[PDB]
C-alpha cells in the first residue's frame, strides 16, 4: 500500500512541477481559448495554434528530471515499475496538459512503447527518437467509420504486400492527436492476409504522415469539444506505398504487438480518471461550501453530503483496484493481470463520469461552462467508455475469465 | 388517454410538417456547421448568422396554421388547451429548429405569456405583438453569476423606483436568446424593496436592449455547444433608466408574475424531452440493429435489448405523468397541479439524459460527434437537470407537497 | 384520466371496506402470529390455520355488493371495464387478505378466468361456480423445479392421452395456495404431445386435489415467509389419471389459453404493487416525521425528502403506465396492447421494490421486522420480478416489439 | 498486497476447516430447519436448539490452532495484525456458522475487546475467560425501540449511582445473541448523568442475565428469519440493581469505550461481507451455466454477463477498500482511519446486497427459497445496512472528513 522512495519523491514533485508551473499556463490558455469564442471573434484556425509555453514547459520538465516517466527503460525512461509510476498518473490526470509536459500523454507513450518493443534499429533511430525527445508526435490509427470497430476482426482497411512494398488503403478514424502541426508519424493497424491463421491476420505499419496518399479529411468533436490542439482526426489512405520495411515486426503480427503491450496503457488511462475524478470533487466542496442557498451552504442542502461520501467512496475504492492492477503487472506480468486490466477500464470512466456530474451539479449552471474544467472533464470521463474499447466488451472479457473458473 | 379530433389533425400536421420541411434544413444548417469546424476553417463570427431558410419556414409554418400553438387565447394564438398542446410539443421536441418555426419556442412563449396577461395595452402593441408575429426575439433575465440563484430571494440586481422612473442595476447570465441579432427586449426580473413584505419584493421590468446601460458582455458554452444563433449570454446593466410604466403589472409583483404563468411551461419543457428521447431511441434501435460485431447486429449484444426496453418503459411512464400534468392544470388548475408540475421537470431530463446516454453508447465513438444529434441532445437534456431550477429545488417542493398531507 | 361514476363509488367501498373492517382483523392475524414466534411458543402446524374472521368478512364484502369484482362478466361477476377495476386493485393491493376478501386474488382470479372462458359446461357447474362462491381455492401447476421454466418450452412433465383418460406425471412447484385445507383443485399445465406443430404442444387440464397420485410435498418460504394459509407448495404427479374430459377446451391448446387470457392478470398485480408501495410511502413519511435525531425530524435529515420525492414520482409515472395499459386492453385489446402488459410487468415490482426498501432504511432496525408491514412488502415486489415470468423475459418482449418497428 | 507468511498459512487453513468440517454440518442443520417447516411440523420451540455438532466443531478448532484469531493479543489470541486477520474475516463471512466456530462472531469478539482493554482484574477472571473459551455467549444492548437510536446521544435507558449500587432502567432491542441458552453476560450501555460534559453522559455495564429485573421480552425477525439460536431480542431492566463494580471502566466512560475500540470491528463485518458477495457470486455462475432457456445456458441470455462482470469489479474494488483501512488501522492507528472505517460500513454492505440481488435472479424463485444460501444472505447485507449504524450516518461521517479539508 505505501510506494517507494522514489515514487514518493516524484510524486511531490510531479504535484509541485504541474500546481506551479503548468496550471497558470493551463488556465491561461483554455481562458483565451473562452475569451475569443464568447465573444465571437477571431478566427477558428486560431484556436488550433499549439501554445508557445508547451516547449518552455517540457523543457523545465526535462531538466527536472520529470520526462518519460512511464517507460520502464532506466536508460532511455524513468526505469519505474508499473506500481511506481502509477501514483504519477493520478497526479498528471488533474491536468489537461500535463501528460504532455512530461511526455507521458496517449497517444504518444502507448506508440513509443510499441516502437522500443518491437521496432528494428532504424525504425527506433528515426522516430522512436524524436518521440522519445518530444520534438514530434504521432497517432495510432484502428478505428474505422463504417465498421464496428470494437470487434477489431471487423477491420476492413488494408496494409498489403506487394513485392518490396506495402500498400495501403483505407479510412480510419478518431485518431488522437492527428491534428498537430508536428503529427509526423502514423502506426496504421490494418488488415493483411485474412486467410492466415486466427490472430495472423493483421499487421502494424509505421507510415510517416508526409506520405503521398494520406488526407487528414477532418476534426471531430466530443461534444462540441475539437481537444485542440492535436485533436482527433479522420485520416484516409489512398495507394499509400511504402517499403515492406515499414511493418513493425513483421506482416501478419498486429494482434501479438497488441497482446503482447497489453498492460500498462490501461492503468495510465484508469490512474489519470482518478486525478480527474479528484480535481471535481475538490470543485464539488469548495463551490458547495462558498455558495449559500435557503439559508445554508449549498453542501449542507439535501442529498449533497451524501453525494460527497458516496464520491470519496467510488474514487477511493476505485483508486486501490487500479494500484492493485499495477501491482499485478509487476509481480505476474500481464498473463496474471487479464482480468484486472479490464476490471479497471470498465471502472473508472464510469467512477468518473459520475463524480464529475455530481460536481456540475452543485455549480449550477457555470457548471457546464468552461469557467471550470469540469465540462471538459465529463466529456473526457464520457469518451474513455469508449476509447480504448467499449465498457461492454470489457464486461465480457471479465465475465468470460470469471465463468472460466467452473469448468 | 385520446386526443381531441383538434390535437390528433395538429399532431399529424406538425410531425408531417418538421419531416418534410424543417428537418432538411436543420440537417444542411448542423452539416455545414460541422463541416466549417472539422475543416479548422472560416471565422467564428460566421457561425451565428441567423439561417436564412427559417424565415422561409415560419411563413410556411404560418400559412399552414401551425403557429402559435402554444397560447391559449383563440384569437392571438391556437386556442389550445394544455392536453392538446401536450403532443405536438413532444413532436416539436423532435428538432432543434421546430420550436422556433412554430413560435413555440422558450423563452419567447414564456415572455409573450407574461405579457399576454400582465402587460399594458401599450406593451402588448409595442412589444407582444412582434414576438407574437414572430419578428423579433426576447430573452429572460433572472440568474445572476455572483449568487446562488436556485433561490431566487439570493437576487441581487436591482430594480427601483427613483421618481418617475425604474433604475435598473446588475449582472445577470445564462439568459437564452440574447446573442440574436433580432433579440430587441428582455424582461428582466430584480430586487425592489427588501424591506416589503415577503412576495412582493421584487419586480419584473420590460427592458428594451437597445436602452443605454445594457451590454451583452460574452456567450456561454454548455459543453462546447454554443447554440447559435440565440445562445446563452451574460447581461450588465449599469445606470439603465427607464419609464416607470416599464415595470411589468406593477414594482413588487414579481413573485405574483412567476407564480400567475406557472404551469404550462412546464409542461412544454417536459413534453419537448419526451421527443428528444424518442428520437434517441430511435437512432440507437437503427444503429443497432444495422451495424454488426461479434458475429451478431450490436442490439443483439449483451444487455442492448434489455436497455432499449427500460429506454421504452421510462419514456411511456414520463410522457404519461407529464399528459397527466396537463390534464390536471386544464381542470383544477396550477392550485391542483403543484407537486405534478415539480415531478415532471425532475422526471423528464433525467429520463432523456439516460436514454440519450445509452444511444451514444451504441453509437460507438461517433455518438460523442455531431454526425449524429445524440451528443447535443444529451447536453441539452442535461442542461434542463438545472435550467428553470435545479433537480434538487423541485424534488424539494414535492417532498414538502408529500409530506403536508400527513399533518 | 377520470373514472367512470362506477369507479369513483367503487374506490371509495373498497377502500372505506378495506379500512374498516378488514385492516383490524389482518393486523390481529399477523401480530398473534409474530407473538407466537417472539415468544419461540406454539406448534408450526397452527400457524397456518385459515383466520375465521376472513368467511365472516368475505360475507360482508357479498353483502356490500364487493365481491368477483375483477370478472367482466355482468352476470356472474361486477361487469367492470379494465378501467374501472384498475384502481379498486390498487386500493386491495394495500393489504395482504384484501383480495381474499373480495374474492379477486390470485392465483383463483386468473383461474376462475380460464374456466369462464375455456370451461365446458360441466367444468364450470363442479368447479368455477364453488370458486365464484369464495367455498374452494385452486392452484395453477406450470413451473417446475429442474428446468427453467421461464421458457415455457422448457415444461417436462406431461399430460398424455391414453385412450379415454388424460395421464398426468412430474413435478411442479412455487404452486401458489396449495397449502390451504379448501384448494380443493389445480390446472395443470404440461406438455402432451411434443412431434405437434410449435404452439399445440402443451396443455392445461382440470385436476382435482383428492385424485390417487397427487402429493403436495413441501411449502415452500420467500425470505423466511410461508405466506399461510395458501403458501406456495411443491406439488408432484405420479401416475395421476383422470377422464379426458379433465383437458381444458383439448389437448394441445395450453399456449392459446394462456395467450387467449393475458392482460388483466398482469394489469391487477400491476396495480396492486401501486398500493403496496403507497402505503410504503405513507408509512415512510409518518415515520420520518415522528422520530427524531441529529437535533432534526428524520425526514429532515441528509437526503430524505429527495428520497421521499422520488417514490412520489416513481408511484405515480407507473401507475400511470399500467392505467394505460388498461385503457389499452379496453380500446384495442390484447392485440395493441403486446408491450404494454410487459412494460407494467418490470415496472411496477421494481418500482415497488425500491420505494419499500427506502422505507425500511428510514425504519431502522424495525423496518426489517414484522412490527411494520414493509418487510413483507418488499419480499412481496421482489417474488413480483419472478412470479409470473422474471423481468428479463418481460424485457425480451418490450425490445422485440421496440425493434420490430425499423424492419 | 500480499499477506504475511502467517496469514497465508491461517487463510488455507480456515478455508480447508470451513469446507471440509464446517458446511457439511451447516447445510444439514438449515436443511433440517427447512424440512421441519415445508412439512408444517413440529414445534417453534425446536427451532431454537443450539446444534449439538457445534462444541465438537469448536474442539476441533482450538485443537488446529484456529481460535480468538480476531484478538490481537498473542497470549490469548491469534496475535494477528488487521491486516493479517482481514482475509481470514472473508472466509468466515462465506459460512453463517464459521464464526462461531473460530470464536471470532459478532457480539463476542467485541465484547471481548472492550473486557480485554477497559475489564478489571475481576471481571477479566469472571466474564472474559469464559468468552475466551468459548463457554458462555454475550449481548451489547444499546439500540432502544422507542428512540431514533442512530443518534446514541438520544439514549434514554439509565444506569445511575445509588450509593454503592448501579441502577439500571429500560428497554433495549436488536440484541443480537440474547436467545442463547448459554448468553450469561450483557455490556448494557445507557445514559448516567445527562447533565456532565458532552461524550461523559454515558456509561458501560457488565450485566449477568441472571440478575432480577431482567426479562428477554421477545425475540425479532429479520424479514422472517429468526437467526436461531441466538436470535435478536428485546430486553428489559426493571430496578436492576448491581455493584458500582459492575460499571466497565468507571461512570460516565461510555463514549470513551465506544471511541477507543473502534476499527477493528468494522473491518471484521467488511470482510465478512466481501465473502458472502464472493459466495453469492459463486452461486450466480454455476447456476447460470448449467440451468439452459431460450436455447442457452442462462449466463447468456441478455445482459447476465455484464451483470457478472460488475459483481466481479465491485467485489474485487470493495475487498481492497477494506484491506486499505485494515493497513491504516495497522500503521497510522484509528486515529488515520476515521473516513476508512465508515467508506467500508457504507460500501460493503450496499455492495454485497447487490450481488446477492443478482444471484437470487439468477436463480429463478428458488433464489427466494432457503434450499440456497441467498435468500438469507441478502437480509444478512440488509440488515448490514443499519446494524452498526445506518449508512446515511457514515456518510454523514465521510463527508464531514472530506468538507474539513478545505476550511
Ligand atoms: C476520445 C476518443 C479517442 C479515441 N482515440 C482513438 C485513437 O487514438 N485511435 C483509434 O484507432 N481509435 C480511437 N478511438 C475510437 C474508439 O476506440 C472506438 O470508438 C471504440 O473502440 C468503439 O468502436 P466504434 O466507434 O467503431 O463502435 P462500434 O463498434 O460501432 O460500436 C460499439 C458499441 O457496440 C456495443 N457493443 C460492442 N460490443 C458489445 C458487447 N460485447 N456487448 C454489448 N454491447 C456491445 C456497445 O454499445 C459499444 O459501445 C477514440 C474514441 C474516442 C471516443
Ligand atoms: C441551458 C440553460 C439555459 C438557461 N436559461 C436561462 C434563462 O433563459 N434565464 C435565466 O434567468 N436563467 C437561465 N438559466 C440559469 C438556470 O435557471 C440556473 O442555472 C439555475 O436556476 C441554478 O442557478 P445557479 O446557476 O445560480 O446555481 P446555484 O443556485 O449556485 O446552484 C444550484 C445547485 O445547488 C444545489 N442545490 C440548490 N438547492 C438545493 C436543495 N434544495 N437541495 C439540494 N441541493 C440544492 C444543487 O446542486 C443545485 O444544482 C439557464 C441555465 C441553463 C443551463
Ligand atoms: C411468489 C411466487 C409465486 C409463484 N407462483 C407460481 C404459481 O402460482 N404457479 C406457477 O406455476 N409458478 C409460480 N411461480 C414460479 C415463477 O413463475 C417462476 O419462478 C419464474 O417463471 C421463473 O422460472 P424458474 O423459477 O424456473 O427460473 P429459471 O427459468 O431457472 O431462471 C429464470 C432466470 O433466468 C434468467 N433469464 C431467463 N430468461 C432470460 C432472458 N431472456 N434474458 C436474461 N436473463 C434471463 C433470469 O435471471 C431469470 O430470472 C411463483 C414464483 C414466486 C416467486
Ligand atoms: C441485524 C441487526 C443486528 C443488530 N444488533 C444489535 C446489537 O447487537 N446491539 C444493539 O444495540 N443494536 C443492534 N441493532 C440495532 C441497530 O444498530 C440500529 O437499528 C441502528 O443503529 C439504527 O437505529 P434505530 O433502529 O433506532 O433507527 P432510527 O435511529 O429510528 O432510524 C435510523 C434511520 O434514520 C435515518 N437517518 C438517521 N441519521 C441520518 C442522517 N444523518 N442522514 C440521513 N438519514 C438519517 C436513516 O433512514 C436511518 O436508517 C441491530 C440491528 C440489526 C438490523
Same mark, same amino acid.
Given at each position: 500500500?505505501?510506494?517507494?522512495?522514489?515514487?514518493?519523491?516524484?510524486?511531490?514533485?510531479?504535484?509541485?512541477?504541474?500546481?506551479?508551473?503548468?496550471?497558470?499556463?493551463?488556465?491561461?490558455?483554455?481562458?483565451?481559448?473562452?475569451?475569443?469564442?464568447? +465573444? &465571437? @471573434?477571431?478566427?477558428?484556425?486560431? =484556436?488550433?495554434?499549439?501554445? %508557445? *509555453? $508547451?516547449?518552455?514547459?517540457?523543457?523545465? +520538465? &526535462? @531538466?527536472?528530471?520529470?520526462?518519460? =516517466?512511464?517507460?520502464?527503460? %532506466? *536508460? $532511455?525512461?524513468?526505469?519505474?515499475?508499473?506500481?511506481?509510476?502509477?501514483?504519477?498518473?493520478?497526479?498528471?490526470?488533474?491536468?489537461?496538459?500535463?501528460?504532455?509536459?512530461?511526455?507521458?500523454?496517449?497517444?504518444?507513450?502507448?506508440?513509443?512503447?510499441?516502437?522500443?518493443?518491437?521496432?528494428?534499429?532504424?525504425?527506433?533511430?528515426?522516430?522512436?527518437?524524436?518521440?522519445?525527445?518530444?520534438?514530434?508526435?504521432?497517432?495510432?490509427?484502428?478505428?474505422?467509420?463504417?465498421?464496428?470497430?470494437?470487434?477489431?476482426?471487423?477491420?476492413?482497411?488494408?496494409?498489403?504486400?506487394?513485392?518490396?512494398?506495402?500498400?495501403?488503403?483505407?479510412?480510419?478514424?478518431?485518431?488522437?492527436?492527428?491534428?498537430?502541426?508536428?503529427?509526423?508519424?502514423?502506426?496504421?493497424?490494418?488488415?493483411?492476409?485474412?486467410?492466415?491463421?486466427?490472430?495472423?491476420?493483421?499487421?502494424?505499419?509505421?507510415?510517416?504522415?508526409?506520405?503521398?496518399?494520406?488526407?487528414?479529411?477532418?476534426?471531430?468533436?466530443?461534444?462540441?469539444?475539437?481537444?485542440?490542439?492535436?485533436?482527433?482526426?479522420?485520416?484516409?489512405?489512398?495507394?499509400?506505398?511504402?517499403?515492406?520495411?515499414?511493418?513493425?515486426?513483421?506482416?501478419?503480427?498486429?494482434?501479438?504487438?497488441?497482446?503482447?503491450?497489453?498492460?500498462?496503457?490501461?492503468?495510465?488511462?484508469?490512474?489519470?480518471?482518478?486525478?480527474?475524478?479528484?480535481?471535481?470533487?475538490?470543485?464539488?466542496?469548495?463551490?458547495?461550501?462558498?455558495?449559500?442557498?435557503?439559508?445554508?451552504?449549498?453542501?449542507?442542502?439535501?442529498?449533497?453530503?451524501?453525494?460527497?461520501?458516496?464520491?470519496?467512496?467510488?474514487?477511493?475504492?476505485?483508486?486501490?483496484?487500479?494500484?492493485?492492477?499495477?501491482?499485478?503487472?509487476?509481480?505476474?506480468?500481464?498473463?496474471?493481470?487479464?482480468?484486472?486490466?479490464?476490471?479497471?477500464?470498465?471502472?473508472?470512466?464510469?467512477?468518473?463520469?459520475?463524480?464529475?456530474?455530481?460536481?456540475?451539479?452543485?455549480?449550477?449552471?457555470?457548471?457546464?461552462?468552461?469557467?471550470?474544467?469540469?465540462?471538459?472533464?465529463?466529456?473526457?470521463?464520457?469518451?474513455?467508455?469508449?476509447?480504448?474499447?467499449?465498457?461492454?466488451?470489457?464486461?465480457?472479457?471479465?465475465?468470460?475469465?470469471?465463468?472460466?473458473?467452473?469448468?
Amino acid at each position: 500500500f505505501a510506494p517507494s522512495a522514489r515514487a514518493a519523491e516524484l510524486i511531490a514533485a510531479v504535484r509541485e512541477f504541474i500546481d506551479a508551473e503548468v496550471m497558470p499556463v493551463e488556465r491561461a490558455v483554455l481562458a483565451h481559448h473562452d475569451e475569443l469564442l464568447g +465573444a &465571437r @471573434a477571431g478566427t477558428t484556425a486560431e =484556436l488550433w495554434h499549439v501554445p %508557445p *509555453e $508547451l516547449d518552455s514547459l517540457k523543457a523545465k +520538465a &526535462r @531538466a527536472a528530471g520529470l520526462w518519460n =516517466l512511464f517507460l520502464p527503460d %532506466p *536508460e $532511455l525512461g524513468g526505469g519505474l515499475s508499473n506500481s511506481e509510476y502509477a501514483p504519477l498518473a493520478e497526479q498528471m490526470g488533474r491536468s489537461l496538459f500535463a501528460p504532455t509536459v512530461f511526455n507521458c500523454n496517449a497517444p504518444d507513450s502507448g506508440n513509443m512503447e510499441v516502437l522500443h518493443r518491437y521496432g528494428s534499429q532504424e525504425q527506433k533511430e528515426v522516430w522512436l527518437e524524436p518521440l522519445l525527445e518530444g520534438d514530434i508526435r504521432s497517432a495510432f490509427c484502428m478505428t474505422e467509420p463504417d465498421v464496428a470497430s470494437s470487434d477489431a476482426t471487423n477491420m476492413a482497411a488494408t496494409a498489403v504486400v506487394e513485392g518490396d512494398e506495402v500498400v495501403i488503403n483505407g479510412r480510419k478514424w478518431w485518431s488522437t492527436g492527428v491534428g498537430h502541426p508536428d503529427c509526423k508519424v502514423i502506426i496504421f493497424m490494418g488488415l493483411t492476409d485474412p486467410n492466415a491463421h486466427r490472430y495472423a491476420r493483421h499487421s502494424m505499419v509505421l507510415v510517416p504522415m508526409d506520405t503521398p496518399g494520406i488526407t487528414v479529411e477532418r476534426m471531430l468533436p466530443t461534444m462540441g469539444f475539437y481537444d485542440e490542439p492535436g485533436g482527433h482526426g479522420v485520416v484516409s489512405f489512398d495507394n499509400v506505398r511504402l517499403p515492406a520495411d515499414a511493418f513493425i515486426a513483421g506482416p501478419g503480427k498486429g494482434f501479438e504487438i497488441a497482446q503482447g503491450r497489453l498492460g500498462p496503457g490501461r492503468v495510465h488511462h484508469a490512474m489519470r480518471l482518478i486525478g480527474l475524478a479528484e480535481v471535481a470533487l475538490e470543485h464539488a466542496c469548495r463551490r458547495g461550501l462558498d455558495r449559500t442557498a435557503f439559508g445554508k451552504p449549498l453542501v449542507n442542502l439535501g442529498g449533497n453530503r451524501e453525494r460527497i461520501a458516496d464520491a470519496r467512496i467510488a474514487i477511493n475504492q476505485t483508486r486501490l483496484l487500479v494500484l492493485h492492477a499495477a501491482w499485478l503487472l509487476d509481480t505476474v506480468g500481464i498473463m496474471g493481470a487479464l482480468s484486472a486490466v479490464s476490471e479497471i477500464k470498465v471502472a473508472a470512466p464510469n467512477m468518473a463520469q459520475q463524480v464529475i456530474d455530481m460536481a456540475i451539479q452543485i455549480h449550477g449552471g457555470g457548471g457546464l461552462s468552461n469557467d471550470f474544467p469540469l465540462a471538459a472533464a465529463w466529456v473526457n470521463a464520457r469518451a474513455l467508455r469508449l476509447a480504448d474499447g467499449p465498457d461492454e466488451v470489457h464486461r465480457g472479457v471479465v465475465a468470460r475469465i470469471e465463468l472460466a473458473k467452473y469448468a
